[PDB]
Amino acid sequence: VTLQRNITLLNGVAIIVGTIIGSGIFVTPTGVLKEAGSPGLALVVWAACGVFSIVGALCYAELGTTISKSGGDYAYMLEVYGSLPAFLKLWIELLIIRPSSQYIVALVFATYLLKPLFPTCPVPEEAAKLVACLCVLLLTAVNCYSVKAATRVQDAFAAAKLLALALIILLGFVQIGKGFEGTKLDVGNIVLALYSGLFAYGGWNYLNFVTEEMINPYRNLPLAIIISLPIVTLVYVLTNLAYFTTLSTEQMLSSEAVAVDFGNYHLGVMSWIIPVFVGLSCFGSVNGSLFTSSRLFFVGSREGHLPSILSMIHPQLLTPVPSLVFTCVMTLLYAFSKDIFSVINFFSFFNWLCVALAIIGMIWLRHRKPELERPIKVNLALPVFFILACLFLIAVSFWKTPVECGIGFTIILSGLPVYFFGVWWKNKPKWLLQGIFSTTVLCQKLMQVVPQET
Amino acid sequence: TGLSKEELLKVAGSPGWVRTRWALLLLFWLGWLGMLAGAVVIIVRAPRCREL
Ligand SMILES: N[C@@H](Cc1ccc(N(CCCl)CCCl)cc1)C(=O)O
């Protein structure tokens, strides 16, 4: 069997717009405004970080249609830097970046969804963790049954976000109808203000991790980026403009969840509307992050980096069942760690590093292989502008927050041992090979799954 | 590398394995419903925030 190309142009938009927006816009603005220090300059960095996002994604629109392959930012460096550099990324994406991101966003789903049953006090931890995990389990099942089901789910919760942010913008314009100061302009500060948007816009690369599942990627991938990411930019500046109609700097810079207080200010009878919409927003972000992660671990196994259980597909339903089950188990195993919001911050920069290495690889390929076909090309200034902007922002981390870095960098270096034993060694002891094969065929028999035919 | 497709056809249709999948795809859904009932019990058996 082979994975059929079920993602339409519209579903391709819902994969990206439905996973960019997530929790970011409804909880982040306080953390922009703390470093901007002014409602004038805050609305500047929200646009400027948008521009950085468009030029980044436009580099990925090219890169993805030059390679024309589903492994996203892993494939696009495997084709360049080779086996071990791609493995270091894959190990980190498999063990840390993606299980943590799924789990915390599933937690954001739970804690906001329960919030109107606990309006003024923290929701109980067991209820949050159960509800978070029930989300990850249910979405895994939906992703196992049908690509058609999971993509038609992704529409609903892409729409849910745009409806929620439409409700924010609607209330904002209603307050304008009813009826730059203080700025901390320091050249060494405002770069940290721009960094705050690279949680809120982050995720525009997700559509590249599913390239081989779009109906006609040479049109759909660049077009879905160009339809999506400018719309997000517009929605964010209008959404922040809306918040600044209602909440003063002193409210916004202190408040826990700016959109919920905005909801309480206007919608007194039904104030739970925004809390539940931030919840449902997150449910779609998890779905997309889970769908998209499954493809990475699957692709990694084709190209020889991971055990050959994860390359298998279920013949009756045509989904990479072992990859989704692995994704889920590895995410639920993450849930009981304590200091997660340190973890995902000290690894925050590793995503930007890899995005930079990918577009560096794209220019290195435009030198070494003019032989490759390129159905769309970008003028080389934009990549160079984008790599300058990336490597500038990586450097900020080591000025403002270097202290954690060794704990993260230890795991990156811990990728090398596992590469040698798992991939370079080729399993010389035949008793270990028989154990691997035994383990494999148990999964085969159990899940009813088989390798892909090209 | 793992097992052949056409090799797997010889084993995967055995009643033992079909009964095994029927049991597990019941036990997963049952276990999810277990966590759901659990979560609802936590939400009942917890002290509500005092009003302002
Ligand atoms: N905008 C998102 C948040 C987000 C952004 C970037 C990442 N990534 C890694 C840094 Cl945690 C990208 C690779 Cl998973 C993950 C999550 C939302 O609001 O759901």
Author numbering:
A (entry chain B): 44 to 222, 233 to 507
B (entry chain A): 162 to 213
Give verbatim excerpts from the published study on this entry.
Among the four molecular entities that constitute System L (LAT1–4), LAT1 and LAT2 belong to the SLC7 family and form heterodimeric complexes with the single membrane-spanning protein CD98hc (4F2hc; SLC3A2). In this study, by combining the lipid nanodisc system and cryo-EM, we have resolved the structures of LAT1 bound to different compounds in three major conformations, outward-facing, occluded and inward-facing, delineating the transport cycle and the structural changes associated with inhibition.
Given the successful structure determination of LAT1 bound to JPH203 in nanodiscs, we next determined the structures of LAT1 bound to a physiological substrate ʟ-Phe and a slow substrate melphalan. All three structures adopt a similar outward-facing conformation, in which TM1b and TM6a are widely open with slightly different angles. The phenyl ring of ʟ-Phe faces Gly255 and forms van der Waals interactions with its Cβ atom, consistent with our previous finding that Gly255 is important for recognition of larger amino acids. Melphalan shows similar interactions in the core, but the additional bis-(2-chloroethyl)amino side group is placed in the space surrounded by TM3, TM6a and TM10 to form further interactions. Although the moderate local resolution of the map (~3.9 Å) obscures precise positioning of individual atoms, each of the two chloroethyl moieties appears to point upwards and downwards, with terminal chloride atoms within halogen-bonding distances to Tyr259 and Asn404. Notably, the occluded pocket observed for BCH is too narrow to accommodate melphalan. The transport process of these large amino acid derivatives may involve a “loose” occluded state, where the substrate is not as tightly confined by surrounding residues as it is for BCH, yet it could still be translocated across the membrane by a series of conformational changes.
